[PDB]
């Protein structure tokens, strides 16, 4: 059948035909007009049946020969006499309205369908999500139009409680009264709740127009909105999204689906609202402007397992208004004052004439209702009585079940309605159980309900008592919220690749991931020995800083809004912002380095760059408050973050805006100085004091209190306890500024010598210069080996791959390797003694020297890149060479487009030679630089310097070269000028930041270096190997300075959040929009105080009476 | 439309012919210069535009291999029948 | 245009109809050129198509690319991309 | 230093636990030098009843802005009862 429906659902066909009233209408001949008229006790006439039991029977009479014995006339019950058959009407209707083709899903089932079957159709076939609420609207039909305000409120509130609680508004479907007002309400607040509210009208197949059109198995069946000018029949309504078209008989009989609606009001009740929540899906009843049989239906609800409550809408109509007044004028839960029956029954009488026979019979259906006032609710329209029905409806299911507030809260948690929990569940007098808000917190954290995690903390939930090991294990092992599916791909990549099917994640496995995403020497709290013991054994199972364990959780589970919540809570804000930037940055890299449908890396890198900006904006906040303590905030050991450092975490994530921030750049400036005050010293005197040692003792050093914000070495800090003479030398030579200038002078003296050796005759044996030069490069290479070993992450391959990423460190290896090839050939070569350069081993050795020296001039740009002005130009040069590449490839093609025709036209008689690869490229290249070769153009001229090249076709070449230079000089060189002019500012801005960023790695490399430059360094190397087989900088605070610093951190985070709102709130965009919203509210009130005074001036001539 | 007019039941051939053959609103006076340039140049004085003549214009303005619903065989038959 | 389906398709057809109506207006003799009016009309629907593509692309990238290549079946078996290339609708 | 469990505020304090026989000089000393408090320009000693459920919405707004405004501008010490019921509860 290719439809789950047809195998399952059916219709009803009235197989059996029975008489009507038995009166043939008029018109004496009775036998055939019996065929013309006789509405079966079905309700359709004999011929409208078309049934196969009744198709070849009208020939004789029909079913049931003769009178059939009046008793047996009273025997048609559809059960025996109407057949279940395959559906014939399920599809998608379409409404003809402005730009909305509004769709639905009609089914056409028999009323006998099992209630399980219905819910299945709704959920799997129609692919609907189980609702968090069901608002079953019951009212009267053809209720013309409600007053303008009362339609606005019941039109905003029903939509607001259905868009926020994902609810199914069960209805009647007929475009008259209830469904008519529900639909208009939808249309007045559509397109914000469009694909969120699912409105199922349960209509009969009786009172239904274009009934024959809806027939058609699996169709896009059409439908109209032109109300049939004559008909009492009813049309389905525009905005209802689904339809249950029950069938038992025919037209009329609008009472066979009432039982099926009740089934769906039950079967949803037995489903759990959420996988974690034990409460069933709620069901509420909304009465507005009802009927005579409403108050009957109301009675049924409040007498069931459990009592489906009722929210009545007074001020709209008759039954609501009746039911409004009666339960309002009731005893607390019971009878009335001195008999109120006179007014009540009179009140009941005017709506509906009953008249003491059954106007009393209402008083019984009207007593048990008001006796159940606790379950009944009423929205007093026009009295701000719970702020449209959304509060009232949702409230109705919390107050009227005498339920625990645990269940009342959790319902709000599944609804995501914090206001209803904070204004009706956390109200004064509420008394909670020992750990019930904890179970709410556990559900809010898993369900990613940040706004309840806020509330549960604000009330009393301590995350120190809350957060334990076995619980925080659960939080990783959930699928009941927003998840990072990569956390398993990461936990796989650390646990050797094997994940058993269960594999309940362990915190030790999370610690291994945090070590891998944070890189280097990071050691998490979970991988330590002290945790692997308490863990496998299982206050001690409670973590000391819980909100640092959940910040990581929220990040590893890719829960930014929870991460951007738990970050404000707790201490070490700037640290956690730089960790998170690092976790997301590594999570992002491993997402791009993997195969997956959703890349989830532009999401993670943005998440990383969101916390990276929080750290910078807190640094700018601390720096604007105190500069000295802000620099201390960059270098204190964290002690919950692997003894790391907020700066070290930023350098780990290449978070350049933080390292290029003026605070770090000023600390970096102060670590460069050392104990020397270069504000009352000059570079002349540092150089002078390197060459004149006793001039070290005439320059200004820095006190211990001008060195407290500066991370130091231990030995350096041990000489802040006392300045004596030998201490004053240890302060000079160990400053990074001095190690620099003490290396530059050796390096400049090195080039002066190596320039001399390369320009002067090189004899058999190396001269004293060339020995001094080899010694430098030899020991300089030992230093680079030592730099690589004593670097960072113990994996030999990592230290390698880092050091070979800098430009000049690649050049250093070529420069060092090439020099000792050249020395091997130079020194290892048999001198000829007739004349040098007859030995080609010797020549090759020298020519490597003459080329190796180019590496060593270009390395001066690394020394010159220490200046604030020069260095950004040096980095800039390379960023431009990379960006001008494709312009220069075009310039190389125009070159060959010219050199090959020229060489071919001017030298026709050439055999193949390697000189043909020079001559196609040589002169055309030197033309780019202004050499025109004027007397080689027009080789047939008299002034020509190539008179023998004159021959056939050579008159073409001056035309060719005229085009060539026009292209190269007038187009391509000036296009490259234009390139540089329009890319200058942005490469200069990048190069300033990359310069400021790499000033960390540079300055911090000159703390670790020995004191002696690369010729005499070997002493320092040897001394460091002696004390290796015989025996970086840190910020030392006393315990009171750590206190004063954690205060300063806290105080500056407060000023950050305070000043962020004070700016947002004090902005014209915010002041226009709240002004906008107040003038709305006022205007409403001004046309209501304006109404009241219009009801006062009428009361000047009435009181006059 | 918002009230109840269905453009599916509304819009027919002889009606949608009228809508091209009106002068009682904002008009494109070039639609005749186009219907001329496709029908060989000859426009009799009456010349009530036909949808087949509009299909020829839509093919000419859309270019290439475009074949409108009006120039097909299945429409030239139902059309000349009605 | 807001009414019915195949919105992005109809926006690129209209851009093509007005663009050709505009070319044949400039290639003709007439007191009112009516081409800066038609090309603006063309460039108004051309922008509707781009702004719906940017809307589909920001929602799902894989299905938005499918929206460029499905046969239309009411537009001569053509393709929303092919209609844009037909009108030199570069954006 | 106690610590309160609230939204993003670990609110701190300085409990002392002294005998009621302490000389009144000693107290002011603790307040000023040890707790490092600045001598106030005013002392608003609030005296009221306990467990006073909740004031009307407007009257809570006014006694909530005014006490804060006369204490933030006059650097004042609002002496209280401490118990989270009534006076200290509303303060
Ligand atoms: C970041 C840090 C990275 C570090 C990177 C470091 C990388 C270092 C890389 C090093 C690569 C070194 C390549 C040298 C090439 C030698 C070839 C040569 O000259 O052959 C000639 C000499 O042949 C001899 O046997 C000469 C022996 C005496 C001289 C000693 C050589 C010193 C080598 C230097 C040691 C360097 C110390 C390195 C210290 C670091 C052969 O030619 P011939 O003699 O004219 O003819 C012979 C023919 N016949 C046999 C037929 C007669
Ligand atoms: C240390 C030595 C420095 C010397 C300079 C050496 C060049 C320095 C180059 C820096 C950056 C530019 C890219 C790297 C170049 C390598 C190849 C390459 O990328 O090819 C590209 C295709 O290009 C071709 O297919 C054409 C190559 C023709 C070679 C002609 C060489 C002669 C002229 C020129 C020789 C004279 C030198 C010109 C210098 C201005 C592919 O690149 P891509 O995939 O589009 O990637 C671009 C960047 N992206 C990854 C961010 C998208
Ligand atoms: C990122 C940067 C990378 C580079 C990228 C670009 C690639 C550059 C590649 C260029 C190709 C060069 C090939 C050389 C051909 C063989 C040379 C030879 O045999 O001997 C010659 C080598 O001695 C010299 O003096 C000439 C060396 C060439 C100088 C190049 C300058 C122009 C630069 C061009 C730049 C524009 C390139 C345009 C695009 C292609 C000597 O003379 P001969 O007559 O040839 O032979 C000896 C005979 N004789 C003794 C009688 C004289
Ligand atoms: C603004 C100023 C210009 C005025 C306007 C009027 C135009 C005036 C032109 C007029 C052309 C007629 C001159 C030919 C003279 C006689 C033959 C002769 O001596 O030939 C000589 C060369 O020259 C040639 O072989 C032919 C040159 C033709 C190209 C001239 C440019 C065309 C116009 C513009 C093209 C631009 C692109 C067009 C698109 C815009 C041969 O002498 P040789 O070379 O010294 O070699 C002899 C020795 N051998 C025997 C060993 C080889
Ligand atoms: C730039 C300032 C900053 C610091 C720089 C770093 C400082 C360190 C820098 C360099 C190392 C030390 C340099 C001097 C070493 C050689 C001394 C010498 O004379 O050797 C040579 C001596 O022997 P000879 O000359 O072969 O003897 C021949 C004698 N005979 C001919 C009589 C037999
Ligand atoms: C590894 C780290 C090194 C650091 C430096 C420490 C080591 C440096 C120390 C000592 C090394 C030098 C040893 C000299 C031995 C004698 C040489 C000789 O015979 O004569 C030469 C003398 O020497 C010179 O003229 C100097 C040669 C080097 C050039 C410049 C060195 C400056 C850099 C380093 C110092 C400043 C540093 C600056 C910093 C800003 C040349 O003689 P002449 O008179 O020209 O010959 C006549 C020519 N005629 C034949 C054509 C007529
Ligand atoms: C494949 C070859 C071996 C491997 C080399 C690989 C490179 C290894 C690295 C370095 C090499 C070690 C230093 C130079 C060695 C000199 C040797 C020499 O012959 O000197 C001669 C003069 O020249 C000198 O005495 C030069 C002295 C200055 C050296 C500069 C470092 C001093 C700084 C201190 C700080 C630390 C310095 C050290 C840091 C490493 C004296 O020798 P000779 O015999 O009297 O005369 C020459 C020969 N003849 C007899 C034919 C005339
Ligand atoms: C790990 C890094 C790579 C290292 C690579 C390995 C490097 C070492 C390479 C090679 C080892 C040295 C070979 C020895 C020479 C054998 C011939 C000989 O004895 O003498 C002949 C030399 O004839 C020549 O042509 C010499 C050319 C030598 C230079 C080539 C090496 C360039 C290295 C590239 C730069 C790399 C820099 C580093 C880049 C990073 C002739 O001289 P003779 O014999 O005395 O007398 C004449 C006799 N005859 C006329 C009859 C012929
Ligand atoms: C025996 C020997 C006697 C003495 C020898 C004397 C030797 C003299 C040695 C050097 C000359 C330069 C002296 C000026 C220094 C100024 C101060 C300074 O530090 O400025 C900067 C230079 O920082 C550097 O690192 C400069 C490195 C220079 C080497 C490059 C040479 C270029 C060669 C290519 C040219 C070819 C031509 C070369 C010639 C053929 C760094 O400062 P900053 O980072 O801005 O910090 C201050 C910031 N503030 C202002 C905010 C506070
Ligand atoms: C003989 C003596 C000559 C004179 C000595 C001169 C010494 C040199 C002087 C100054 C050197 C400048 C310092 C560089 C600073 C670091 C830059 C760096 O790390 O790499 C930069 C790129 O890579 C380069 O820029 C490569 C180095 C450029 C040298 C230019 C050679 C051109 C010649 C060849 C043509 C000759 C034609 C003829 C052929 C025969 C950084 O680029 P980026 O943008 O940050 O990132 C790249 C990735 N991207 C592509 C995606 C963007
Ligand atoms: C730009 C627009 C078009 C205008 C072009 C104007 C056309 C130009 C006009 C006329 C045509 C060219 C010939 C005129 C000169 C002939 C004189 C002569 O003999 O010259 C030489 C031969 O030269 C030849 O034999 C060349 C023959 C044709 C070359 C190909 C066409 C060039 C035009 C390309 C156009 C590019 C278009 C690019 C399009 C963007 C010299 O010969 P010789 O040495 O005296 O002979 C004796 C030799 N012996 C001693 C060895 C025996
Ligand atoms: C896409 C670009 C198109 C242009 C181009 O790049 C690619 O195409 C390349 C092909 C090269 C030639 C290949 C073969 C030879 C033969 C050789 O024969 C040895 C002779 C003898 C010594 O006397 C042996 O003993 C001499 C050199 C020569 C002619 C090359 C010249 C350069 C050329 C033209 C290159 C040119 C730059
Ligand atoms: C074709 C070969 C055999 C001939 C020589 C090629 C030329 C172009 C070579 C010889 C030595 C080379 C230089 C050696 C060292 C450096 C320093 C480095 O930081 C940038 C490149 C630079 C500046 C090289 C540029 C190219 C260079 C000048």
Curated annotation (Swiss-Prot), chain A:
Reactions performed catalytically: L-seryl-[protein] + ATP = O-phospho-L-seryl-[protein] + ADP + H(+); L-threonyl-[protein] + ATP = O-phospho-L-threonyl-[protein] + ADP + H(+); Mg(2+)(in) = Mg(2+)(out); Ca(2+)(in) = Ca(2+)(out)
Cofactor binding note from Swiss-Prot or TrEMBL: Binds 1 zinc ion per subunit.
UniProt keyword list: Acetylation, ATP-binding, Calcium, Calcium channel, Calcium transport, Cell membrane, Coiled coil, Cytoplasmic vesicle, Ion channel, Ion transport, Kinase, Lipoprotein, Membrane, Metal-binding, Necrosis, Nucleotide-binding, Nucleus, Palmitate, Phosphoprotein, Serine/threonine-protein kinase, Transferase, Transmembrane, Transmembrane helix, Transport, Zinc
Activity modulation notes: Channel displays constitutive activity. Channel activity is negatively regulated by cytosolic Mg(2+), Mg-ATP and low intracellular pH. Resting free cytosolic Mg(2+) and Mg-ATP concentrations seem to be sufficient to block native TRPM7 channel activity. TRPM7 channel activity is highly dependent on membrane levels of phosphatidylinositol 4,5 bisphosphate (PIP2). PIP2 hydrolysis negatively regulates TRPM7 channel activity. TRPM7 kinase activity does not affect channel activity.
EC number: 2.7.11.1
Lipidation (S-palmitoyl cysteine): 1027-1028, 1030
Tissue expression from the record: Found to be expressed in brain and skeletal muscle, with stronger signals in kidney, heart, liver and spleen.
Gene null: resulting phenotype: Inactivation of Trpm7 in mice results in early embryonic death (6.5-7.5 days). Mice die as a result of trophoblast defects and consequent failure of implantation. Tissue-specific null mutants shown defects in cardiac and renal morphogenesis, organismal Zn(2+), Mg(2+), and Ca(2+) homeostasis and thrombopoiesis.
GO molecular function: actin binding; ATP binding; calcium channel activity; kinase activity; magnesium ion transmembrane transporter activity; metal ion binding; myosin binding; protein kinase activity
Quaternary structure, from the entry: Homodimer. Homotetramer. Forms heteromers with TRPM6; heteromeric channels are functionally different from the homomeric channels. Interacts with PLCB1.
Annotated protein name in UniProt: Transient receptor potential cation channel subfamily M member 7
Organism of provenance: Mus musculus (Mouse)
Name of the gene encoding the protein in the UniProt record: Trpm7
């Amino acid at each position: 059948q290719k439809s789950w429906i047809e195998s399952t659902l059916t219709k009803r066909e009235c197989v059996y035909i029975i008489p009507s009233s038995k009166d043939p209408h008029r018109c004496l001949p009775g036998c055939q007009i019996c065929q013309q008229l006789v509405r079966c006790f079905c309700g359709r006439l004999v011929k409208q049946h078309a049934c196969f039991t009744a198709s070849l029977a009208m020939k004789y009479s029909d079913v049931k020969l003769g009178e059939h014995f009046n008793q047996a006339i009273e025997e048609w019950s559809v059960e025996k006499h109407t057949e279940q058959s395959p559906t014939d009407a399920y599809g998608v209707i379409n409404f003809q309205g402005g730009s909305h083709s509004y769709r639905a899903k009609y089914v056409r089932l028999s009323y006998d369908t099992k209630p399980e079957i219905i819910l299945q159709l709704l959920l799997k076939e129609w692919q609907m999500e189980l609702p968090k609420l069901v608002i079953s609207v019951h009212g009267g039909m053809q209720k013309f139009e409600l007053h303008p305000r009362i339609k606005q409120l019941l039109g905003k509130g029903l939509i607001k409680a259905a868009v926020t609680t994902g609810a199914w508004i069960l209805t009647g479907g007929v475009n008259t009264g209830v469904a008519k007002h529900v639909g208009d309400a939808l249309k007045e607040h559509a397109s914000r709740s469009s694909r969120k509210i699912c409105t199922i009208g349960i209509a009969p197949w009786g009172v239904i127009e274009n009934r024959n059109d809806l027939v058609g198995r699996d169709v896009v069946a059409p439908y109209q909105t032109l109300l049939n000018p004559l008909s009492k029949l009813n049309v389905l309504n525009n905005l209802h999204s689904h339809f249950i078209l029950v069938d038992d008989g025919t037209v009329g009989k609008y009472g066979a689906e009432v039982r099926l609606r009740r089934e769906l009001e039950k079967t949803i009740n037995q489903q759990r609202i959420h996988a974690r929540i034990g409460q069933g899906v709620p069901v509420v009843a909304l009465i507005f402007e009802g009927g005579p049989n409403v108050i009957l239906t109301v009675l049924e609800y409040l007498q069931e397992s459990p009592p489906v409550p009722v929210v009545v809408c007074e001020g709209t109509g008759r039954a609501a208004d009746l039911l409004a007044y009666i339960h309002k004028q009731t005893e607390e839960g019971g009878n009335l004052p001195d008999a109120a029956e006179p007014d009540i029954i009179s009140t009941i009488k005017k709506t509906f004439n009953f008249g003491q026979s059954e106007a009393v019979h209402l008083f019984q259906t009207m007593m048990e209702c008001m006796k159940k006032k606790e379950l009944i609710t009423v929205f007093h329209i026009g009295s701000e009585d719970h702020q449209d029905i959304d509060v009232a409806i949702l409230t109705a299911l919390l107050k009227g079940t005498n339920a625990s507030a645990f269940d009342q809260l959790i319902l709000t948690l599944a609804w995501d309605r914090v206001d209803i929990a904070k204004n009706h569940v956390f109200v004064y007098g509420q008394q909670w159980l020992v750990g019930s808000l904890e179970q709410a917190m556990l559900d809010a954290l898993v369900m990613d309900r940040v706004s309840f995690v806020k509330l549960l903390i604000e009330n009393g939930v301590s995350m120190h008592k809350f957060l334990t090991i076995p619980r925080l294990e659960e939080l990783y092992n959930t699928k009941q919220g927003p998840t990072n599916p990569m956390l398993f791909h990461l936990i796989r990549d650390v646990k050797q690749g094997n994940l058993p099917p269960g594999y309940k994640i362990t915190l030790i496995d999370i610690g291994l991931v945090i070590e891998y995403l944070m890189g280097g020497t990071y050691r998490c709290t979970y991988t330590r020995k002290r945790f692997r013991l308490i863990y496998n054994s299982l206050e001690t199972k409670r973590f000391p800083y819980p909100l640092n364990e959940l910040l990581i959780w929220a990040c590893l589970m890719k829960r930014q809004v929870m991460a951007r919540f738990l970050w404000q809570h707790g201490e070490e804000s700037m640290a956690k912002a730089l960790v998170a930037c690092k976790i997301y940055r590594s999570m992002a890299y491993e997402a791009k380095q993997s195969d997956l449908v959703d890349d989830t890396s532009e999401e993670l890198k943005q998440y990383s760059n969101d916390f990276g900006q929080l750290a910078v904006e807190l640094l700018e906040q601390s720096f604007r408050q105190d500069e000295t303590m802000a620099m201390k905030l960059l270098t204190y050991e964290l002690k919950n973050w692997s003894n790391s450092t907020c700066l070290k975490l930023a350098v780990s994530s290449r978070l350049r805006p933080f390292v290029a921030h003026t605070c770090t750049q000023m600390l970096l400036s102060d670590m460069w100085m050392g104990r020397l005050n270069m504000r009352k010293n000059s570079w002349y005197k540092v150089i002078l004091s390197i060459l004149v040692p006793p001039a070290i003792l005439m320059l200004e050093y820095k006190t211990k209190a001008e060195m407290s914000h500066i991370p130091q070495s231990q030995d350096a800090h041990q000489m802040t306890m006392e300045l004596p003479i030998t201490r004053k030398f240890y302060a000079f030579y160990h400053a990074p500024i001095v190690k620099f200038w003490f290396n530059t002078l050796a390096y400049l003296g090195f080039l002066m010598l190596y320039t001399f050796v390369v320009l002067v005759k090189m004899e058999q044996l190396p001269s004293v210069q060339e020995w001094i030069v080899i010694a430098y490069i030899f020991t300089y290479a030992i230093e680079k080996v030592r730099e690589v070993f004593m670097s960072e992450a113990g994996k030999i391959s990592q230290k390698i791959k880092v050091w070979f990423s800098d430009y000049f460190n690649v050049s250093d290896t070529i420069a060092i390797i090439s020099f000792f090839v050249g020395f091997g050939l130079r020194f290892g070569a048999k001198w000829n003694y007739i004349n040098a350069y007859d030995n080609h081993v010797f020549v090759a050795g020298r020519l490597i020297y003459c080329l190796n020296i180019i590496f060593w001039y270009v390395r001066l740009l690394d020394f010159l890149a220490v200046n604030q002005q020069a260095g950004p130009y040096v980095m800039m040069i390379g960023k431009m060479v990379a960006n001008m590449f494709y312009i220069v490839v075009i310039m190389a093609l125009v070159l060959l487009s010219f050199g090959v025709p020229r060489k071919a036209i001017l030298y026709p008689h050439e055999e193949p030679s390697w000189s043909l690869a020079k001559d196609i490229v040589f002169h055309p290249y030197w033309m780019i630089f202004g050499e025109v070769y004027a007397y080689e153009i027009d080789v047939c001229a008299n002034d020509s310097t190539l008179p023998t090249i004159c021959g056939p076709g050579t008159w073409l070449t001056p035309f060719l070269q005229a085009v060539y230079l026009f292209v190269q000089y007038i187009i391509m060189v000036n296009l490259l000028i234009a390139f540089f002019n329009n890319v200058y500012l942005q490469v200069k801005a990048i190069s300033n930041i990359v310069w400021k960023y790499q000033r960390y790695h540079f300055i911090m490399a000159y703390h670790e270096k020995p004191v002696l430059p690369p010729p005499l360094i070997i002493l320092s190397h040897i001394v460091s190997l002696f004390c290796c087989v015989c025996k970086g900088p840190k910020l030392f605070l006393t315990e009171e300075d750590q206190k004063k610093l954690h205060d300063f951190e806290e105080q500056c985070v407060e000023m950050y959040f305070d000043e962020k709102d004070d700016k947002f709130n004090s902005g014209s965009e915010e002041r226009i929009r709240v002004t906008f919203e107040r003038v709305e509210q006022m205007s409403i009130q001004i046309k209501e105080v304006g109404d009241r005074v219009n009801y006062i001036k009428r009361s000047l001539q009435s009181l006059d009476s």
